Nucleic acid binder design. Structure first.
Lengths: 141, 42, 50, 13, 106
RNA sequence: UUGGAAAAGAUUAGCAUGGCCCCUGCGCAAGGAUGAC
RNA sequence: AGCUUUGCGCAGUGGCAGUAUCGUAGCCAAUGAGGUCUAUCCGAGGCGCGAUUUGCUAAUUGAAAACUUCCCAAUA
């Protein structure tokens, strides 16, 4: 399915990041067949219209669009990238690297909170924002 | 030939609110224009 | 309904007047003492009554 | 649009 | 009593645009003024031997209604690297201070 | 006058406006009763 | 001509304001909403959703809480 819009070349990506001025651009780098990307994209579609006011989601295929692999260290099976007014926003998830999510959370509310915090920090002017949760521990007991 | 129009109480209240809003906007524009000082608070 | 875009405008520009009734409805003048206090030294009621 | 992604998914799976 | 307000004060509307980028909006204020109908002046208050702006700047627009409309439209607009907040300029001079003192005692 | 060096603005509180109501005055519309060789 | 009424708006005093003040784009409503009294009787909006403009001043926190070059030594 994947009703979320897709970008088929680097040109689409680099004018999609600059297209939004009052909304956070979300880019999922990965592959549809990849299950983890499947989980994240299901979560995103579950909240695609909830964050329409202040966020936008685009799906980018690594094979179709491989130019960002070296610059963004796109070596994981899947990454999630946050941009605002041409500036990347780093998120302090507690996983060691603040640039990309690199994992698929099943709860859509966690992603909603993450994108809301990113928007709040980007409109205020901070380039690095703190996640309102710690993902170092999976919280499984 | 001319026929008058009768307005209900709610219509009259809406017209009064619109007229008051227009008067307030005109006063704000005049004050922000620098033509005259704003009225003294009271 | 989509969740409204979060924003942080100026919290308050003026005070007094109606503002006071507003807090009165929610945020009225409570005891504001010995209710959010802990009394560092001693113990009230039982030790672990909770 | 959706069919273009469905064909890519089916071919790759 | 710095002699700098004698070039833009022409019975016009002065708007204080603050919360702008310290290293940006050097001449972008001129572009904003040109976009504004009046396009009279877009002076930026900066400190000498500093290399950066001092923050708020004074935009002089001849048309008052056009200035008010632009302030309504440009309030919080993303200009440069930060949204510029537009308010009314104070311009409290010696004559104004004397008048305020006279009105304070009466 | 002279010489020398160079929080992307927060928070709380108060007053007035706006809102609503009685009354007053006025304006306007539509009238009501009534006085005068 | 004097006087007076209803409705309306402007201005003003006084008063009220979360069982208060509105929007309603949703629905129903004088072709009748809602009624335990007066029921072969009364006659208006009601129900859900969603709100509670602007200016001035003061105070607190903070090094700085924002209006256009400041400082140091000496004489006049």
């Amino acid at each position: 399915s994947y009703m979320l819009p897709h970008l088929h070349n680097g040109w689409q990506v680099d004018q999609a990041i600059l297209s939004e001025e009052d909304r956070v651009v979300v880019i999922r780098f990965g592959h549809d067949w990849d299950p983890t990307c499947m989980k994240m994209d299901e979560v995103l579609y579950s909240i695609a219209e909830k964050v329409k006011n202040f966020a936008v989601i685009y799906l980018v295929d690594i094979t179709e669009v491989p130019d960002f692999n070296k610059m963004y260290e796109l070596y994981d099976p899947c990454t999630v990238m946050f941009f605002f007014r041409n500036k990347h926003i780093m998120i302090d998830l507690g996983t060691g690297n603040n640039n990309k999510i690199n994992w698929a959370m099943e709860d859509k509310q966690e992603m909603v909170d993450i994108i809301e915090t990113v928007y709040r920090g980007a409109r205020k002017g901070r380039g690095l924002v703190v996640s309102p949760k710690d993902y170092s521990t999976k919280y499984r007991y | 030939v001319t026929l008058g129009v009768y307005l209900t109480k709610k219509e009259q209240k809406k017209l009064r609110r619109q007229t008051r809003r227009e008067a307030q906007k005109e006063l704000q524009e005049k004050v922000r224009l620098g033509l005259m000082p704003p009225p003294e608070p009271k | 309904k989509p969740l409204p875009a979060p924003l942080d405008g100026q919290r308050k520009k003026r005070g007094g007047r109606r503002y006071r009734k507003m807090k009165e409805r929610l945020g009225l003048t409570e005891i504001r003492k010995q209710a959010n206090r802990m009394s560092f030294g001693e113990i009230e009621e039982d030790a672990y009554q909770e | 649009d959706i069919e273009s992604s469905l064909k890519q998914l089916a071919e790759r799976r | 009593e710095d002699p700098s307000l004698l070039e833009w004060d022409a019975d016009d509307f002065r708007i204080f645009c603050g919360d702008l980028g310290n290293e940006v909006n050097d001449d972008i204020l001129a572009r904003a003024f040109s976009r504004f109908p009046s396009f009279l002046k877009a002076k930026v208050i900066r400190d000498k031997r500093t290399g950066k702006t001092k923050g708020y700047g004074f935009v002089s627009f001849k048309d008052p209604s056009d200035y008010v409309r632009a302030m309504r439209e440009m309030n919080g607009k993303y200009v440069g690297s930060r949204p510029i907040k537009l308010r009314k300029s104070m311009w409290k001079d010696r004559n104004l201070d004397v008048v305020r003192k006279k009105q304070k005692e009466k």
